[PDB]
Design a protein around this ligand. Structure first.
Ligand SMILES: NC(=O)c1ccc[n+]([C@@H]2O[C@H](COP(=O)([O-])OP(=O)(O)OC[C@H]3O[C@@H](n4cnc5c(N)ncnc54)[C@H](O)[C@@H]3O)[C@@H](O)[C@H]2O)c1
Ligand SMILES: NC(=O)c1ccc[n+]([C@@H]2O[C@H](COP(=O)([O-])OP(=O)(O)OC[C@H]3O[C@@H](n4cnc5c(N)ncnc54)[C@H](O)[C@@H]3O)[C@@H](O)[C@H]2O)c1
Ligand SMILES: NC(=O)c1ccc[n+]([C@@H]2O[C@H](COP(=O)([O-])OP(=O)(O)OC[C@H]3O[C@@H](n4cnc5c(N)ncnc54)[C@H](O)[C@@H]3O)[C@@H](O)[C@H]2O)c1
Ligand SMILES: NC(=O)c1ccc[n+]([C@@H]2O[C@H](COP(=O)([O-])OP(=O)(O)OC[C@H]3O[C@@H](n4cnc5c(N)ncnc54)[C@H](O)[C@@H]3O)[C@@H](O)[C@H]2O)c1
Lengths: 338, 338, 338, 338
């Protein structure tokens, strides 16, 4: 049974813990976050403005947390090397602070005794990215101690792109993701951290905000065959959670929406079960809150100009789907020997 | 000077009036709306959650309105034929009820003394559509008494599509328009008007909602050369006003974003002055509230996969841009003889 | 087991059905709504932006619905007297259309064979109002066949006022309820249904909107001793669900927030179990979505100027609390003999 | 002509500058904000998600700004003592960083050459607070070099309380302010800066959030006669700007809503012109965006239980009203002798 330690108990960090609490093949044993006292952590875990009250019990036991009768050690270290993961028995660390996305920084968790590290975001350097159901079996435990679970958008696009490319072939594609807001955004017009993404610093509650994303490009690394064939952008909107991918692509072989739908269905019911999903109902974003799939094809919203040029629509709970995939990755990593 | 009569004093009708009050080449002489007393009409004109207080004075004078010292006759006819446009001195009628989108119905305004009628939406029949700066000069007064100003989305896409197709040639394109809130969506999950668009009946305040749009095809009627080369859809988000068009297309001639940008700029400073606009700043939706342009190219938001496959982003205040275009068309129609 | 018929399959009608599906002492056997196709009814029950997916199975069976393998008859009678409640086996009717709020109209259901009717709103005439945990045992089956479950605001305020008045005595009080959005409001500035409340017709998504409410005075009828001692108003804000009562009162007997808290605690763990609740945590509105309590005291939000002038804060999921109470009342009504 | 220097170019700092640009008796000569490049500053002044595009011109000149022709020196000092106010010719400094709310920290501006300092918030120590139209004439230049313009909420309540206390006398009162969000709140559930106000760290876009505020008590300092007679709390909501005060008070002398209205009317058209305002229209929050009044009485929203127990409703653009008052205070200070 793999043990997990969480650094950065934020949106992703807390949902990863919630996912672990629902499984018997992985146990959370420690959490670190310098911006939260143990009482604050208990509070943020218990209540969620999007996913409801925690399904179980949360209590402070001395300096630590007692979640569902299990003891979870708490730390407040500003630097990863200062967290006693080993002494705590944490084998794999979910690096979800958003501030240590390189091998150099993320590897600091190793000094602390961790055996493996999973960055909950695409890396800034060459750390390998894996997407469950697409290329995770490529992971080599003898070569990597620090890996990446990519982004929420890449986890939505990769599985779909794989299915389409395998069956029909993607000549070229452009993507736009209408994405719900994130912690990086601001409630009122203000300066963005580091003064880089100016648009991201504009009132999140009343603006449609164009944004950059490397998700489409990253798919070209997770699926080499698609290198240089995809690129995209993002549009941030006021909703608290759930996003949607709009993939416009030219196919190498003709395909109707019905045929694309059938290909997605065969994949979802077989090799990508639990990862790729689909629907034919008149859904809207809130219907996916809490959905654990990485990508859900919206049949009725897809459109096609002709048999080779189509626009595919796929939903994803950027918080829930991604967190469950990170947990799946952690379990997979454990199964391959730490 | 042309005199205008407004049927349906809704979001569009009211903005059209506000636009006229600012111009000397056109005067609003009458308003008709059976769903609101004169007192309520005055209230709706003086206060607006998106465009602010009315710039001027608004008084109730008997059964009519005194706006900026001018008399505006008010009527509560339910049937377009019962409205005394001629007696009021109304030459052109702005048909903005959204219920008379056919020449048969819309033509009823002529039985009241009105000479011309402009439907503030795409017609359900064969009524000709005109987009200012694109095909309005094709209008012939001796052949049509009832015309259409198309839709807000069409007025944003058509200008852009024309510049791009003229300069580089559009082989095929797919559009997605992210729309702000409209008068059809619901505040809470409830029955849709007609029980046809189920998604549109879902809570608009906390949902991303896929929707249909005929704009892409309408552009194929406004610009015959693009007939059958475009199609699209919409995605509604919880913002009060301002929308954006995401146009993904394959070009005939290779073109960089810089060149596309330069081409828009030339048209914007020339044959489409006041219609086509452009920006290179990190703008967000709220920056366009009140903007009178039909379409505003967002240079930094555009992205290109190759020199022949690009995604263009263009903003448009779905209310202000469109309304001002309808008044421009009214003025144009009058300049051609009634 | 008591059987329920639902007239008006709106927000309340649907949640009433969801509430019944979880209980074994009451079953919905029929639904009537002439402005909603069964296919759409199935859709609205299956999906909800606020309460999530329906916990169970909903299928269209001919012209009726099959819910959890049970046939629920569906009608389209615009006139209550035309609904075959009796033939359908419906004993008690949940009148939730919002248009038959008088004894004259509501009693038409009796012509259809129903034995009792519960109006899901305060009546326009003198139909008796009952609030579970407050005055429902005053219901006399031999004298009334038509009753009212009052309003969501009243169900929140009445239990709290009863506790405070019983223990300390309320000399006089003023209430303000901050309400989350409801169907009544509009997504954009426009005419209100009836043209009475101009403010209510303003854009609900970006406005704080003052409004009227008779809940404070209704409490004076539900609790006679408080007649003439309470009055109040409402303030609508752009949040999807869950509201809060802000009660400012002068007490006849001195009391600290701690003692008021204990009094509420006693009631909540005693005579008002499942009706009145309480919390000492730093909660926010979303933490109550789905909560079945009628009123939840927020200890930390309460404030006192002195020992006899206090401001008490109580939360309520205006949809979930109210609906579960209506069902409780239906079960209570049946237990008293039909 | 008074000169102004601004430290903390945030919501208030930028609106203070905007207010100045519209006046001929005061000029901004310098701005300091370490989290903004001169280009970023130009951008944030040029665009505003709530108050629209800047009315005038803004260009980067070397390392400074050129606003409407006037040159404005730009600094990036994190430590107040390091800002060369004196050399820049800035006489009065607007301390709007939100982090230097004490005489000790704020007075550090004097070391740079500034002559007077105004903290744009209530102080954490004994720095005197002044509310234009209420007690600003009690200012004494020979006594203080550092003063406070109190809070936005206090500027709304103080004028109203003074009028009511002067005319009828306030026995006791409890206040609740429904407040739009601020920069302190978060877009998604997270840890509040400092680990204090936990509720303030909950998703701002979809929650009704109770909060503390010393504004009511502060009124007791600005109006000694009211010390110990008022207190209150706040309720934060998703709107970007504009707030409303709900004052429930017991009057020493009986008074009707009409009489209270007349008293505010007299004050508004007399001693408090430009400060206290009133309305009898069906207004909503957006109608006050850009309003320069400190407090606007909503006659129709007020309600009374008796002749001595009333609930008064008063609006205020927390950003615009306050900023203009701060500028009014700066001019008043200059007129007293620097
Ligand atoms: N929000 C999403 O839907 C989503 C989806 C996929 C991936 N991600 C990625 O996951 C990461 C976290 O995202 P999030 O949305 O949960 O952000 P968040 O802001 O909600 O949480 C980040 C946490 O990091 C903590 N933190 C900051 N510095 C720290 C330090 N030195 N040590 C330990 N903790 C520290 C913060 O206190 C916070 O609790 C980011 O890299 C993000 O891009 C986010
Ligand atoms: N909202 C937009 O941004 C936008 C943009 C482009 C085009 N349009 C089109 O413009 C039209 C109006 O849109 P809107 O958003 O202003 O709608 P709206 O709901 O705000 O107003 C419609 C008005 O029609 C009135 N009406 C109904 N029957 C009438 C009758 N018989 N005579 C006179 N008035 C009558 C209503 O009382 C109402 O005031 C629609 O056809 C719409 O599709 C809207
Ligand atoms: N929304 C709340 O949180 C809440 C809380 C307490 C009380 N209430 C009250 O409950 C009632 C219903 O509220 P709601 O939000 O569900 O309304 P709603 O607008 O969501 O639904 C009303 C339903 O009435 C139906 N209807 C109209 N005429 C009908 C007829 N002749 N026969 C059958 N159905 C008919 C409509 O088709 C619709 O489905 C109202 O009186 C309301 O004031 C609502
Ligand atoms: N927002 C309101 O409606 C309102 C109303 C009344 C009073 N106030 C008070 O005004 C102050 C500012 O409020 P705001 O909403 O504009 O905040 P804000 O977050 O919008 O702006 C604060 C600015 O301070 C800057 N800053 C931080 N440290 C600095 C430093 N060392 N030197 C110079 N600048 C620095 C930030 O970069 C930012 O631009 C606070 O004290 C607040 O409580 C705000």
């Amino acid at each position: 049974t793999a043990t997990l330690g969480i650094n950065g108990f934020g949106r992703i960090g807390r949902l990863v813990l919630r996912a672990c609490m629902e499984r018997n093949d992985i146990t959370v044993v420690a959490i670190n976050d310098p911006f939260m006292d143990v009482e604050y952590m208990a509070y943020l875990l218990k209540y969620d403005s999007v996913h409801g009250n925690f399904n179980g019990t949360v209590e402070v036991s001395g300096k630590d947390l007692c979640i569902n009768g299990k003891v979870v050690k708490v730390f407040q270290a500003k630097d990863p090397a200062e967290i006693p993961w080993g002494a705590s028995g944490a084998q794999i660390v979910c690096e979800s602070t958003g501030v240590f996305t390189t091998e150099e920084k993320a590897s600091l968790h190793l000094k602390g005794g961790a055996k493996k590290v999973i960055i909950s975001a695409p890396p800034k350097d060459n750390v390998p990215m894996y997407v469950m159901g697409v290329n995770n079996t490529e992971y080599d435990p003898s070569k990597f101690n620090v890996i990446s679970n990519a982004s929420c958008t890449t986890n939505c696009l990769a599985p779909l792109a794989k299915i389409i490319n395998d069956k029909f072939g993607i000549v070229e594609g452009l993507m736009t993701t209408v994405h719900s807001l994130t912690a990086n955004q601001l409630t009122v017009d203000g300066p963005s951290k580091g003064g880089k993404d100016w648009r991201a610093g504009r009132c999140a509650g009343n603006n449609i905000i164009p944004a950059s994303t490397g998700a489409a490009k990253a798919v070209g690394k997770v699926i080499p065959a698609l290198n240089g064939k995809l690129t995209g952008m993002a549009i941030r909107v006021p909703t608290p959670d759930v996003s949607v991918v709009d993939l416009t692509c030219k196919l190498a072989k003709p395909a109707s929406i019905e045929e694309i739908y059938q290909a997605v269905k065969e994949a979802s019911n077989g090799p990508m079960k639990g990862i790729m999903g689909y629907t034919s109902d008149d859904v809207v974003s809130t219907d996916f809150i809490g959905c654990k799939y990485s990508s859900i094809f919206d049949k009725n919203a897809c459109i096609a100009l002709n048999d080779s040029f189509v626009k595919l629509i796929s939903w994803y709970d950027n918080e829930s789907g991604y967190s469950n995939r990170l947990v799946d990755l952690a379990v997979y990593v454990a199964s391959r020997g730490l």
